Chains A and B, each alone.
With several copies, the nearest count.
Chain A
Amino acid sequence: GSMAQEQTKRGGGGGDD
């Protein structure tokens, strides 16, 4: 019976031009 707060974890992403 309690609430939570989220911390994100960024995922790798890369593009060319």
Chain B
Amino acid sequence: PPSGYGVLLATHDDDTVDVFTSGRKMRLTCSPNIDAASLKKGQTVRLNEALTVVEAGTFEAVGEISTLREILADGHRALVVGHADEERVVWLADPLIPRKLRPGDSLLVDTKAGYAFERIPKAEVEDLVLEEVPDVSYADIGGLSRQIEQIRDAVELPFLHKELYREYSLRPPKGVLLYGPPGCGKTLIAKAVANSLAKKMAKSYFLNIKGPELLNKFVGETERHIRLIFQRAREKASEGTPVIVFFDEMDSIFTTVVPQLLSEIDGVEGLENVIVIGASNREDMIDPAILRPGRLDVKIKIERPDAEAAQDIYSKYLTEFLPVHADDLAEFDGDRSACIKAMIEKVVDRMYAEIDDNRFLEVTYANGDKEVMYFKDFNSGAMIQNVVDRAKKNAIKSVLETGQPGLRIQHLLDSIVDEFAENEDLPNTTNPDDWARISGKKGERIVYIRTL
């Protein structure tokens, strides 16, 4: 028997129900076979030549997909947007009336019938991009153990004493300012503390914002960008996942944007889970207003590489799995770990040696006390990583040319020389900004600097 189909709208006490069919609404009567109360809103029903509902099927699975905008206060209708940026108000189906529907979800809808039947799952990549993988542990950083303990004291201490603060009616400090030398491992401490915080609650987000690129000089747009960043931070804090907001290169900036930043910090102070971490290499240039007691009370000073850390850093980079030359193994009876340790000690000692190969910088003063800085100074974790990469490249070149695999100290020395030659340019044009960049680390203003 030829039987049509339609979409149920609502029920009535008179055992009659409204059905949308063929583009028009009709008030059909329910057959005695079916139970009127058993019908669900939005359920597809079967019609016949006499326009009587006798059977009820499932929900439709094909049609237009619309993005949900909001849910109305009545709890039965939702406002969505169509494919052509056309917004509509459509009734929700029974299955849609834990799980909680959220704005941005994609829903199957029928514009003619004005019903939404199902939710189509979608995977967002913005959350993955915004956060970072907590892959930086305490062991991943070396030579900063006291910094690690200071960060632990500043961050994890209130968590174990939250009830103490609640009884005492106080506000734990959530402001940590990491100030130290030219970018070496300053941001890596932020990754380490984020990973450690993720470990304790056993999902993790890290919002990194640079300083110079944030500036929107023309008219007040930088305040708008900061407000947007803090609104995103609040949205992330809505979810029960710790979020760390990190600001990098904040010495470039600071009647100005400082009051807006202070207001946003005061607003986010209520969210104690969010941790604000700022980095700046020039504590003198930073306006003391942000350093006032309250928000950013905790300040942590970092440095470089105590030589041992460089060795620790080399061990982290030049692990035991790297190939080793047979001739160098002959000096250590085939003990790979001992050979690696001795090679690291040798290269670190040579790098921090006052020799003719360390003429990187020549420093002149007002009295003319021309001295020479060596490779020990200005050493950095990024520079050591680049040295390791260049050494690996040189070892690969030697393998493909000579044919003998392994690692040699000559590769390390060549990588050191090439990387110092490369690094002679990026921080040191020596007319601008170098005077302060060397005077802050040394402790006295330098009239003239030259590169040898």
- Answer whether A and B touch in the complex at a CB cut-off of 8 Å: yes
Do B219 and A1 touch across chains, with their CB atoms under 8 A apart?
Answer: yes
Interface majority SS (helix, strand, loop, mixed), chain A: loop
Q: Is B219 in contact with A2, judged by CB distance below 8 angstroms?
A: yes
> Cβ of B201 < 8 Å from any Cβ of A?
no
Complex contacts, A4 vs chain B, CB 8 Å:
218
Name the one of A1, A2, A15 contacting B84, with C-beta atoms under 8 angstroms. A15
B-side contacts of A15, CB under 8 Å: 84
- Interfacial chain A residues near B218, Cβ < 8 Å: 1-2, 4
* Shortest CB distance A15–B (Å): 6
Whole-angstrom CA separation of A7 from B378 in the bound complex: 37
Interface size class of A (residues with CB under 8 A): under 10
Shortest Cβ distance from A4 into chain B, in angstroms? 8
Which residue of chain A has its CB nearest to the CB of B83? Answer: A15
Q: Which residue on B lies nearest to A14, using beta carbons?
A: B84
Residues of A within 8 A of B84 (CB): 13, 15
Interface residues of A in 1-17 (CB under 8 A from B): 1-4, 13, 15
Chain A residue, CB-CB nearest to B217: A1
Q: Which residue of B lies closest to A15 (CB)?
A: B84
Q: Which of chain A's residues have a CB closer than 8 A to the CB of B219?
A: 1-3
Q: Measured between C-beta atoms, what is the minimum distance from B368 to chain A in Å? A: 28
Closest to B220 in A: A1
Residues in chain B near residue A3, CB distance under 8 A? 219
* Interface members, chain B 217-249 (any A CB < 8 Å): 218-219
Within 8 A of A (CB), among B179-229: 218-219
A11 to chain B, nearest CB (A): 10
Chain B residues closer than 8 Å to A2, beta-carbon distance: 218-219
A5 → chain B, closest Cβ, in Å?
13
Residue of chain A at shortest CB distance from B85: A13
- Chain A nearest CB, measured from B221 CB (Å): 11
Please give the distance in Å from A3's CB to the nearest CB on chain B: 7
- Closest chain A residue, CB of each to CB of B86: A15
B218 to chain A, nearest CB (A): 7
CB closest residue in chain B, given A13: B84
Binary interface profile of B, 81-102, with partner A (CB < 8 Å = 1, else 0)? 0001000000000000000000
Chain B residues closer than 8 Å to A1, beta-carbon distance = 218-219
Closest to A3 in B: B219
Distance between A13 CB and nearest chain B CB, rounded to angstroms: 7
Nearest opposing residue in chain B for A1, CB measure: B219
Report which B residues bind A (CB closer than 8 A): 84, 218-219
8 cross-chain CB contacts under 8 A: A1-B218, A1-B219, A2-B218, A2-B219, A3-B219, A4-B218, A13-B84, A15-B84
- 5 further A-B pairs in the complex, CB-CB below 8 A; given A1-B218, A2-B219, A3-B219: A1-B219, A2-B218, A4-B218, A13-B84, A15-B84
By Cβ-Cβ distance, the 5 closest A-B pairs, closest first, are A1-B219, A15-B84, A3-B219, A2-B218, A13-B84
